[PDB]
From Swiss-Prot, chains A, B, C, D:
Positions contributing to Fe cation 2 binding: E58, E103, Q137, D140
Quaternary structure and interacting proteins, as annotated: Oligomer of 24 subunits. The functional molecule is roughly spherical and contains a central cavity into which the polymeric mineral iron core is deposited.
Catalytic activity: 4 Fe(2+) + O2 + 4 H(+) = 4 Fe(3+) + 2 H2O
Coiled-coil regions, chain positions: none
Known role: Stores iron in a soluble, non-toxic, readily available form. Important for iron homeostasis. Has ferroxidase activity. Iron is taken up in the ferrous form and deposited as ferric hydroxides after oxidation.
One GO CC annotation: cytoplasm
Binding-site positions, Fe cation 1: E23, E58, H61
Alphabetized UniProt keyword annotations: Iron, Iron storage, Metal-binding, Oxidoreductase
Source taxon at top rank: Eukaryota
PROSITE patterns per UniProt: FERRITIN_1 (PS00540), FERRITIN_2 (PS00204), FERRITIN_LIKE (PS50905)
One Pfam family from the record: Ferritin
Keyword Transport: no
Designated name of the protein: Ferritin, middle subunit
């Protein structure tokens, strides 16, 4: 047992490792979207940069879980980072729809971890999730939802002019 | 009943007073460690200053509970501040080991108070503990644990050169 | 065929994708080493930060290959990022030895890619590797080798004082 | 024989002169496109300025070959600069398509010169092409390809609104 460990359940330690993996998975998915929008036959650089930034953000979320694990006396256990579900992302609307679903998946896992922390009576873990993860998640979900609404308004997927306009005025 | 009092259980009020006393006890223990490391026959000034700073920090934690008590309409009730368990602290490793245990004792009392606040449905008290106490406690426990690991690495208690090196490069 | 593509062999495109994966693998390995040295029972923060920085550097090397692929009209194809070979890294000397071998593995793959680019008569790819990868690789290999020599001098693995001294004066 | 000449093949000297001419040809073509987009019945000033800048860049590439020739002890031999293939350029998409093909023609000639330099074992010439020409060429080809993708998205040639939008947000 780690000398620092106090009120940290084995189940929570394991769940933090799984959450770490999911953040890395989300980072990798966003990097794929960056790569797609940077293609010469897609060429929406502002959209590409949006996803690149989100990839970096998710990597930071992962690192924060690693630091958290060590602070509590848990042990970081890494697994493979699975490749993204798609190799190509269609267009801005398809990619944003995929990002929304990914963000909701990450949010559900955060909420599930919070429920586990509540069940195991771990207020430090609860506070960590609430203070560092849960609000940023709601904000990102709202931003992507707003984008989707605008892309539909702009006539995506069919309306190429609309897609250009979004890249030039929204991101 | 205080005109400001709302959703503040008598049990929580009493527990806040006991927590106040424990913070003061912890401050006094750290001041003892400061005094020890300042002895001419111990003479580890950087270690002494580390404990002096921690003593000041704990006094501030105590004052914050006094302010909290009044904000909720509870009444501050003081008891004797018991002298520290030891008059002399052996060496840097022994003192850090004692500090780790003290910090875990304080942490357990904070967690117990949080459980009481949860049971009495007092989210303001829960938030206070989470926002002002619980994370600082985990950080301090981690820092002291890291120090202990390094002091053992440096060959404490036997290795006097190791003890000198710690005082000159870690604190 | 991409409208931008010129003098870019399918074999080179595929090899760039494999190199991308290896950079990501190397980044993940360094993040594991960071996590290890941040453990309360290891506690060598400067060593941890060294590996954290290297993890970030490798991620940047990967992103540069993604950008390269798109510039040439190739298509980024991602695969799983395999977890590191070890879950724990022993000590500073063991970790540095593993880092040296990892850096030489990455270097060999860069040299193999350069040989392929030479065979396919692709000077742009050759220049890219020479200007952006090959010298940084030699410098990093030299730095790690120098560290290993010093860790052996300091009596690693047995000499804990030596390990402390390295963390405090070399990184 | 020039007193400075060393390891500089007659074939390479002649090929450098031909490359000089091609850079000047490319500069003249871009100046034609500038003139076209500046017409009162075309009136896409930002597009015009893009081509004007590229014309200036190509002239600089030509001057760099003149300086190179003299540095190696070769002799600059000039030929006529042929007028551009077209007197009018249709629209932004047609012009960008022509620019892409021109840039690929220039790139092929640079690659052919690099192959000649390799065959004649002239690393100075190889380095010059790699360091001063080959990457700028790939970047320009990528930029023009990205523009073409966007112009098609915007509904060129038919969609005049799309053409206006490109001139106002992409260049
Ligand atoms: Cl525990
Ligand atoms: Cl508890
Ligand atoms: Cl696990
Ligand atoms: Cl980071
Ligand atoms: Cl797996
Ligand atoms: Cl796909
Ligand atoms: Cl948050
Ligand atoms: Cl109140
Ligand atoms: Cl009340
Ligand atoms: Cl209530
Ligand atoms: Cl009381
Ligand atoms: Cl004060
Ligand atoms: Cl008493
Ligand atoms: Cl005593
Ligand atoms: Cl706190
Ligand atoms: Cl803890
Ligand atoms: Cl090709
Ligand atoms: Cl070729
Ligand atoms: Cl591939
Ligand atoms: Cl980056
Ligand atoms: Cl795989
Ligand atoms: Cl292992
Ligand atoms: Cl380099
Ligand atoms: Cl010469
Ligand atoms: Cl010669
Ligand atoms: Cl020679
Ligand atoms: Cl000639
Ligand atoms: Cl000039
Ligand atoms: Cl002629
Ligand atoms: Cl014409
Ligand atoms: Cl260049
Ligand atoms: Cl190209
Ligand atoms: Fe995000
Ligand atoms: Fe964030
Ligand atoms: Fe995240
Ligand atoms: Fe996210
Ligand atoms: Fe965000
Ligand atoms: Fe403290
Ligand atoms: Fe504090
Ligand atoms: Fe305290
Ligand atoms: Fe404390
Ligand atoms: Fe503290
Ligand atoms: Fe590195
Ligand atoms: Fe680098
Ligand atoms: Fe690398
Ligand atoms: Fe590396
Ligand atoms: Fe490096
Ligand atoms: Fe150009
Ligand atoms: Fe240039
Ligand atoms: Fe040129
Ligand atoms: Fe050009
Ligand atoms: Fe250029
Ligand atoms: Mg467990
Ligand atoms: Mg998972
Ligand atoms: Mg798979
Ligand atoms: Mg509850
Ligand atoms: Mg709560
Ligand atoms: Mg909170
Ligand atoms: Mg917040
Ligand atoms: Mg009462
Ligand atoms: Mg008490
Ligand atoms: Mg007594
Ligand atoms: Mg906080
Ligand atoms: Mg292929
Ligand atoms: Mg591989
Ligand atoms: Mg495996
Ligand atoms: Mg060769
Ligand atoms: Mg070469
Ligand atoms: Mg070079
Ligand atoms: Mg260099
Ligand atoms: Mg000749
Ligand atoms: Mg010619
Ligand atoms: Mg003619
Ligand atoms: Mg260069």
């Amino acid at each position: 047992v780690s000398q620092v460990r106090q009120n940290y359940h084995s189940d929570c330690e394991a769940a933090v490792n799984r959450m770490l993996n999911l953040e890395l998975y989300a980072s990798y998915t966003y990097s794929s979207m960056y790569a797609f929008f940077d293609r010469d036959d897609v060429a929406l650089h502002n959209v590409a940069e949006f996803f690149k930034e989100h990839s970096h953000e998710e990597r930071e979320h992962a690192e924060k879980f690693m630091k958290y694990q060590n602070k509590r006396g848990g042990r970081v256990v890494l697994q493979d980072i699975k490749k993204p579900e798609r190799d190509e992302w269609g267009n801005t609307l398809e990619a944003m729809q995929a990002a929304l679903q990914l963000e909701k998946t990450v949010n559900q896992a955060l909420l599930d971890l919070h429920k586990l922390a509540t069940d195991k009576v771990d207020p430090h873990l609860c506070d960590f999730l609430e203070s560092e993860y849960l609000e940023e998640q709601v904000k990102d979900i709202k931003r992507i939802g707003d984008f989707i609404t605008n892309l539909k308004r702009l006539g995506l997927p069919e309306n190429g002019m609309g897609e250009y306009l979004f890249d030039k005025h929204s991101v």
